[PDB]
Design an enzyme around this catalytic site. Sequence first.
Site, PDB file in Angstrom:
ATOM      1  CG  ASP A  15      28.216  99.797 120.023  1.00  0.00           C
ATOM      2  OD1 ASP A  15      27.558  98.372 120.236  1.00  0.00           O
ATOM      3  OD2 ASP A  15      28.331 100.396 120.145  1.00  0.00           O
ATOM      4  CG  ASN A  69      29.807  94.780 120.286  1.00  0.00           C
ATOM      5  OD1 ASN A  69      30.127  95.254 119.175  1.00  0.00           O
ATOM      6  ND2 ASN A  69      30.251  93.327 120.792  1.00  0.00           N
ATOM      7  CG  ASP A  75      32.004  92.930 117.313  1.00  0.00           C
ATOM      8  OD1 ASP A  75      31.859  93.862 117.020  1.00  0.00           O
ATOM      9  OD2 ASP A  75      32.606  92.393 118.245  1.00  0.00           O
ATOM     10  CD  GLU A 133      38.523  89.226 118.349  1.00  0.00           C
ATOM     11  OE1 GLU A 133      37.333  89.362 118.441  1.00  0.00           O
ATOM     12  OE2 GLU A 133      38.879  90.426 118.432  1.00  0.00           O
ATOM     13  CG  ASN A 171      31.707  97.095 115.616  1.00  0.00           C
ATOM     14  OD1 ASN A 171      31.014  98.346 115.774  1.00  0.00           O
ATOM     15  ND2 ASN A 171      30.895  96.236 116.874  1.00  0.00           N
ATOM     16  CB  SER A 173      27.378  97.706 117.515  1.00  0.00           C
ATOM     17  OG  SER A 173      28.519  97.575 118.403  1.00  0.00           O
TER      18      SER A 173
END
Length: 129
Positions: free
Chosen positions: A48, A46, A52, A35, A59, A50
């Site tokens: 959308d 991301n 992380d 990650e 998220n 959002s």
Amino acid sequence: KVFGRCELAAAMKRHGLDNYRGYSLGNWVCAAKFESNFNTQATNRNTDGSTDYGILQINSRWWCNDGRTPGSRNLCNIPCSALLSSDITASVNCAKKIVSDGNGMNAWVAWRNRCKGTDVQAWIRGCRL
Ligand SMILES: [Cl-]
Ligand SMILES: [Cl-]
Ligand SMILES: [Cl-]
């Protein structure tokens, strides 16, 4: 902070992740490697809108508030910036809520695709725990 592999394993153990909801420590170490490459400061945006955050790439659509993800929930009740600390406490505590939600560690895409079903004990081999 960029953790070493054993240093992180030890910190995760101290914070109660070894066998948490039945996931052995190597699962958690493997998920962090893929990650964030063990970097607490990692961020990734991301599609959308959002983002992380941190060592476990938590998220902002669901779990934390970053002030810029409209209609999002903040289920860990924390600013997303808390997740970037050298102290992993806030990341760990939020991760425990996530892994309890119903889908276990499948919430972490890198875990599902790179760790699940592999010899994850290798990630803690050699460490003094
Ligand atoms: Cl393990
Ligand atoms: Cl949010
Ligand atoms: Cl599970």
